[PDB]
Design a protein around this motif. Sequence first.
Motif, PDB file in Angstrom:
ATOM      1  N   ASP A  49      52.524  39.425  31.227  1.00 16.54           N
ATOM      2  CA  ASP A  49      51.994  38.540  30.168  1.00 16.54           C
ATOM      3  C   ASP A  49      50.662  39.000  29.564  1.00 16.54           C
ATOM      4  O   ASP A  49      50.119  38.334  28.692  1.00 16.54           O
ATOM      5  CB  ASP A  49      51.865  37.086  30.677  1.00 16.54           C
ATOM      6  CG  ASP A  49      50.857  36.928  31.813  1.00 16.54           C
ATOM      7  OD1 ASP A  49      50.389  37.933  32.389  1.00 16.54           O
ATOM      8  OD2 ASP A  49      50.559  35.777  32.163  1.00 16.54           O
TER       9      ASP A  49
ATOM     10  N   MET B 142      50.517  43.368  27.148  1.00 11.60           N
ATOM     11  CA  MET B 142      51.825  42.736  27.355  1.00 11.60           C
ATOM     12  C   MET B 142      52.942  43.773  27.350  1.00 11.60           C
ATOM     13  O   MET B 142      52.859  44.788  26.647  1.00 11.60           O
ATOM     14  CB  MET B 142      52.098  41.692  26.269  1.00 11.60           C
ATOM     15  CG  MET B 142      51.118  40.541  26.258  1.00 11.60           C
ATOM     16  SD  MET B 142      51.455  39.276  25.019  1.00 11.60           S
ATOM     17  CE  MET B 142      52.600  38.213  25.908  1.00 11.60           C
TER      18      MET B 142
ATOM     19  N   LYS C  93      43.059  37.719  29.615  1.00 13.54           N
ATOM     20  CA  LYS C  93      44.391  37.997  29.067  1.00 13.54           C
ATOM     21  C   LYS C  93      44.248  38.713  27.736  1.00 13.54           C
ATOM     22  O   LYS C  93      43.502  38.267  26.884  1.00 13.54           O
ATOM     23  CB  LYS C  93      45.146  36.683  28.891  1.00 13.54           C
ATOM     24  CG  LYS C  93      46.619  36.814  28.556  1.00 13.54           C
ATOM     25  CD  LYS C  93      47.254  35.437  28.399  1.00 13.54           C
ATOM     26  CE  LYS C  93      48.727  35.549  28.030  1.00 13.54           C
ATOM     27  NZ  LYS C  93      49.381  34.232  27.921  1.00 13.54           N
TER      28      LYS C  93
END
Lengths: 206, 206, 206, 206, 212
Positions: free
Chosen positions: B110, B64, B59
């Motif tokens: 995300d 994002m 991530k």
Amino acid sequence: QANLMRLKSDLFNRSPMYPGPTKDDPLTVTLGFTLQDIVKVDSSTNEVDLVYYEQQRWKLNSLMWDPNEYGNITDFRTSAADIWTPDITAYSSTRPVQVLSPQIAVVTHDGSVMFIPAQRLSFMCDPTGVDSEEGVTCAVKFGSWVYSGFEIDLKTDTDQVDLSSYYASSKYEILSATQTRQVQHYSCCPEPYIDVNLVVKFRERR
Amino acid sequence: QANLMRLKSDLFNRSPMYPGPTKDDPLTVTLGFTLQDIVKVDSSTNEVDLVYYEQQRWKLNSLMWDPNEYGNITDFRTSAADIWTPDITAYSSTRPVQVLSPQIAVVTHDGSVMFIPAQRLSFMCDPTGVDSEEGVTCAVKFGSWVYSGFEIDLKTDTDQVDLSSYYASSKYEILSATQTRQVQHYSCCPEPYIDVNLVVKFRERR
Amino acid sequence: QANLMRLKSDLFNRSPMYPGPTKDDPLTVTLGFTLQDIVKVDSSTNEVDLVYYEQQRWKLNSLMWDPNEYGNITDFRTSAADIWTPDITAYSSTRPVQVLSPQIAVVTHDGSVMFIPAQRLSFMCDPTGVDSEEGVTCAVKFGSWVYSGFEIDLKTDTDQVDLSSYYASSKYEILSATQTRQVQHYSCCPEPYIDVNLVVKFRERR
Amino acid sequence: QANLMRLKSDLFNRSPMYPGPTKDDPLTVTLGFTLQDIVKVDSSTNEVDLVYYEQQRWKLNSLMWDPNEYGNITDFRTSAADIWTPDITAYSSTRPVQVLSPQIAVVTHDGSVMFIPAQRLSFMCDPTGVDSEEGVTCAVKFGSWVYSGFEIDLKTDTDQVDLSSYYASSKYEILSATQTRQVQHYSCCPEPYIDVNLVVKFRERR
Amino acid sequence: QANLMRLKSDLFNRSPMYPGPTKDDPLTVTLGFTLQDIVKVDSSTNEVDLVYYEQQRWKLNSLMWDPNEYGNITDFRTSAADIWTPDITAYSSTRPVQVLSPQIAVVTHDGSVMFIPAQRLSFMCDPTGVDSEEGVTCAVKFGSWVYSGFEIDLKTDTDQVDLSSYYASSKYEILSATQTRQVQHYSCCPEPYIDVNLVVKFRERRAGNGFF
Ligand SMILES: *[C@@H]1O[C@H](CO)[C@@H](O)[C@H](O)[C@H]1NC(C)=O
Ligand SMILES: *[C@@H]1O[C@H](CO)[C@@H](O)[C@H](O)[C@H]1NC(C)=O
Ligand SMILES: *[C@@H]1O[C@H](CO)[C@@H](O)[C@H](O)[C@H]1NC(C)=O
Ligand SMILES: *[C@@H]1O[C@H](CO)[C@@H](O)[C@H](O)[C@H]1NC(C)=O
Ligand SMILES: *[C@@H]1O[C@H](CO)[C@@H](O)[C@H](O)[C@H]1NC(C)=O
Ligand SMILES: CN1CCC[C@H]1c1cccnc1
Ligand SMILES: CN1CCC[C@H]1c1cccnc1
Ligand SMILES: CN1CCC[C@H]1c1cccnc1
Ligand SMILES: CN1CCC[C@H]1c1cccnc1
Ligand SMILES: CN1CCC[C@H]1c1cccnc1
């Protein structure tokens, strides 16, 4: 030459490249196999090697043009690197696929593309009993590796694999060969993925 | 197409590429293995060949976006060359890894990335006794080659390797397969390096 | 991310790339080997295959920075294509070296670089007698292919090859392994060339 | 570094790349072979594998500079991709040549270039009788594939192949090795083409 | 150097690259084979390996120049990546073709191109009986993969394959070798596709064995 150069410049040098299908703009790819040869079987590793070509067809609005505006050009050949192509992958390969034909597609004025890669594939297959009358059956699934059924659907025009160019002096004769759409699920992902299952029954030639 | 093109341009064409993790901005990569086939063993060189796919997840804040601003796009597929990817390496390979799937990742709003390379690996493993009832055990560590535990940490979601796609007619049957986070130290460097240790127990199929 | 991006831009995007060492600005490269496996011997061709990793270290003034000006960054990882790297070559290879690790180096604020390529090498070696108690000795020189001792000097930190990661179930056991700086001359050129001579004594494991 | 960077920028970033020799601006390439090993013979296919390095030398006016204007630099190393190199090809190879050394040349202030690629070559050769006292003789021609004698001439400095680095524990010993300029015609083309004929007599080592 | 640099800049850096032939601007490619070696046969897979070079010739108006304007240059060598080249493909290959020569073509002032790739090819061929006096016959078709006869036509200058450079100590001796234009149809497409069919008859080199 002039009109085609102009057409290619207009299709490819003005916009960003097509970013692939989405849930909002899904795509259907038509697949069909032409089996040329079962080249070898390795009974010590349960790998079999096929030579075939895979006809792929899809349609994009971003590849449309009016032939009147481009000297009545209705289609053209172009490098597959100039366009988006579907990531159709064998699911039980044991080696990288070897490419046996030029990476060139045919684009038609309605936005349809035809791309027909010739390939040699090693895949997982137990050939025990190939030297019998009943032969053996093997199967390999072809589908997008990364796009679910919400972005890429597949179809075939026929469930019969084309055997009309199958090598007449192959060590193996084909008893049957089918190509059938299936739905599958994978641990990574909740969404259905679509494949075409190539099922080949063969035996050593008499 | 329009909204996705805009999203990709905004994510990739404005800033310099993400320069990888740092001690100040570390990253955790989740790994999981799906073992498809033990294709062969070479008892003269103590090398064994596996076909598997490796699910990688991480991530980044720099990936994002707000779906409202981009036509409700929640994810997209993109070439792995467009993004930073972790340098996950087998520590006891004897040949370069062969890539069996397209180099395309899925990026989600995300900032999470999923990348699932299918690979064929030859690694160091003594198969003496594979033809017995007890079989043999082999192990290979997967981790960053160049980033210590201060920049890249690893985890698994489960210690159990996914065997639900293991080739049913393989020459070898799997008795057990685990994937476990470990810490290691190397002569070059005082810092801990993290790996996931893939431990497979197998024998010749009855 | 911001400070590192700024540092990389300042080091790499302002000047031309470092053009390599010269007689006026010579460079010393430190080499060290970590031997992982003697994977095979081919007694019909007198070729032996090693898997190892080779730690390379050098220092450039053009890669120096003040950590205060870049958010206390003391080092970073970067693609080996971003920097000059020494052309260290095995002198008796029989195949191209196979690369087993990512091409990524670590650069430190004093201008020092660490690059540790894992490699599989086939080289010239007669294994006759490897199945005896005394074993056999083989040797391969590693050095710049194109830079003389006036541009690239080599050193080792120790003459003992690191055997602490040697594969415990290898077909071959290592009796000794040394790495030693040497000077050589070649027909093409009057200038001395420097190499590190890797000398390995081994035999079949009991 | 500064003066070399300036020299390289002046030689390479101002003009278009040298387009190769012409009938008006011909070039002479000096070739010489250093034979390292006859690695294998395949008596089932009549292919033999050699490892050697090939010293190539030529001279271009466009690579000249005055050392006074560039901090007394008399030569430099540069990637072979920065310069034109001759297309020297083996005429009876059975596989692509494998490159065993870095693709880096040395350019000298008089415009002369030295480039010394190490290669492994499989070529057509019948090894029947290699296990006798008389041994066998084999031959392979090296020359430009596409440039006639009006654009590229070849010469050797000596007709004796350099055997001073020949592997002392090779399976084969060299009885003689010569390198000799020859002129030929081919059906495609009216002009003479030049080659250097490498003739090696060898037998199994006693 | 100066005049050639100028010529290459004018031919290649001003217009877009030639986009290949079309139904309105078709192209004829002349093919000819020079067979160097039958390197091996694999009787367990019915694959045979040939080493040859394939002379290709075609002509484009977009590669024409006046030699007077370019220092009397009548031809030049250039990387095959600088120009369009035909996608000539073996139709029964079992491995990718291996390239054995530099990818460089010769362009002449009339717009004609000569490109002569040396290749090693594995193709489908049953060698059963190769160890007999009569030998075996094998065949492989070469043609465009993607262009029909409306865009690319093929011809040969002779139907006899050049055997004058065939390796004298090959494991196999060549009895005959022909190269013949053919028309074919494929399931994908209604249009005729053109190929050159390379037919080779060979046998093992045996004793000092006669041809009868
Ligand atoms: C294209 O088609 C139109 C409509 O029939 C015709 O009149 C015209 O001559 C054609 N143009 C070209 C360039 O072929
Ligand atoms: C996004 O979702 C809303 C409803 O939830 C919808 O009204 C809107 O049109 C969507 N945007 C696009 C571009 O489809
Ligand atoms: C760098 O180190 C100093 C001294 O401890 C500290 O005050 C400063 O906040 C650090 N800078 C950053 C960007 O973290
Ligand atoms: C080059 O050599 C000249 C001649 O002695 C000398 O005066 C000059 O300082 C030298 N320059 C460099 C950079 O070495
Ligand atoms: C070009 O050809 C003319 C006519 O033969 C000749 O006089 C001239 O010297 C040639 N060479 C050039 C232009 O370099
Ligand atoms: C359906 N694919 C095949 C196995 C994993 C999966 C997948 C999904 C998304 C990105 N990569 C791979
Ligand atoms: C953790 N890696 C494994 C062995 C060497 C080490 C390493 C460290 C830094 C740069 N490259 C390699
Ligand atoms: C030191 N090398 C090994 C033998 C050739 C030599 C060399 C020198 C300069 C350029 N290339 C190769
Ligand atoms: C001299 N070469 C050897 C065989 C063909 C010839 C050639 C000439 C021009 C372009 N390509 C190849
Ligand atoms: C003539 N080719 C060979 C078989 C299919 C056909 C074809 C047509 C268009 C694009 N690729 C291949």
